[PDB]
Amino acid sequence: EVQLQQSGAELVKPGASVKLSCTASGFNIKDTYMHWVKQRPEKGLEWIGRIDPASGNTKYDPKFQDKATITADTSSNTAYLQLSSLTSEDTAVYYCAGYDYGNFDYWGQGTTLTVSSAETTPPSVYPLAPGTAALKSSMVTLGCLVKGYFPEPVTVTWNSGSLSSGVHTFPAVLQSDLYTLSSSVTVPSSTWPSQTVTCNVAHPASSTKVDKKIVPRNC
């Protein structure tokens, strides 16, 4: 059936330039307009532009006129997006879509582009011990700062998964070129610090597997 395959995620450094692929199967790209749409982490869909593969006629959103360049090669049934002079502002998912005026509307799974200088860094996992007002209440919330790592992802389990519920592992945010995420766990005031609560965070890239017992701070 129709399928628009986009390159895998892409890693590139500020100032560099990337070219994302979007290949179409089950239909000839020139029967429609190939679009490229950007979607910043947790933000709207911004249409970058389109390329009428038939005519080579490209149209863009003024904001991307100089930053973007869409091209195509009906041969390989592929369209492309050439982003120039990367900025941290270009970190977003880049969707290509084949469509025009009717019901023929197909989208690609998306390519996530991340603008970062960082090299494959292990995270610094820091056990987050509480700010006590929560102590004299039913449950205590502990957490882990999995900081300054690269690249995503990281699986954060607690007590080796024994602690499955009450956990909130937060999405990572790329700041100053490196990832930082924090996860939280709520356990009864009975379980901690009386019993052990350790956060296990695994970072496959750097191959780091690190456990960290949340020891009450010097309070």
Partner: protein
């Protein structure tokens, strides 16, 4: 030249409910309007095009209407899988801009966040860095505003915020805010407060810890 103003940005609803999302083009788009649904971690999918013609596999519960500049998408009996974002795009002229999007979330009662602040771990101080964290867990609606302060002085830079999406089993939200200071600065001040302003309280829920009061 033409921009779509989608409304509302967020809309809370429940199964069985009817809902209408709107998009107003900054100019006449002649019904060259399409509506897209984007579910979590998925690529947009067309629901309606030409203002009112339902796309393939889009059930009858979705209707589309409008003319000229004002357009609407109505979902009649909200099934559980209709929850997602909705974008309208005009294809009247270049650029084929999108509306800002409408997130349709599961309505549930308000819940104030469970806030928790965490001073910097001794291990981080050892590296000359210092991050104070604040978890604002299980709250609803998602409109919340965190504000950091270091000795009563607001601190805007250094803050790193993140959000989970509406929980599957209880539909609440969660946020985590991190202030990243240097040790030099950190050990030069005493009060770190995290201020959360949410719909459930008129005054900010605040959490503080003093660096040398421990």
């Amino acid at each position: 030249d033409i921009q779509m103003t989608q409304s509302p940005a967020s809309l809370s609803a429940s199964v069985g409910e009817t809902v209408t999302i709107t998009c107003r083009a900054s100019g006449n788009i002649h019904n060259y309007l399409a509506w897209y649904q984007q579910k979590q971690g998925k690529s947009p999918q067309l629901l309606v095009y030409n203002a009112k013609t339902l796309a393939d596999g889009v059930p009858s519960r979705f209707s589309g209407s409008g003319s000229g500049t004002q357009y609407s998408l109505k979902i009649n009996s909200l099934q559980p899988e209709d929850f997602g974002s909705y974008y309208c795009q005009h294809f009247w002229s270049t650029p084929w801009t999108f509306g800002g999007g409408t997130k349709l979330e599961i309505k549930r009662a308000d819940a104030a966040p469970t806030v928790s602040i965490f001073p910097p771990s001794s291990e981080q101080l050892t590296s000359g860095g210092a991050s104070v964290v604040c978890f604002l867990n299980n709250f609803y609606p998602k409109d919340i505003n965190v504000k950091w302060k270091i000795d009563g002085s607001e601190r805007q830079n250094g803050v790193l915020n993140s959000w989970t999406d509406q929980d599957s089993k209880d539909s609440t939200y969660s946020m985590s805010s991190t202030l990243t200071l240097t040790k030099d600065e950190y050990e030069r001040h005493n009060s770190y407060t995290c201020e959360a302003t949410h719909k459930t309280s008129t005054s900010p829920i605040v959490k503080s810890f003093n660096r040398n009061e421990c």
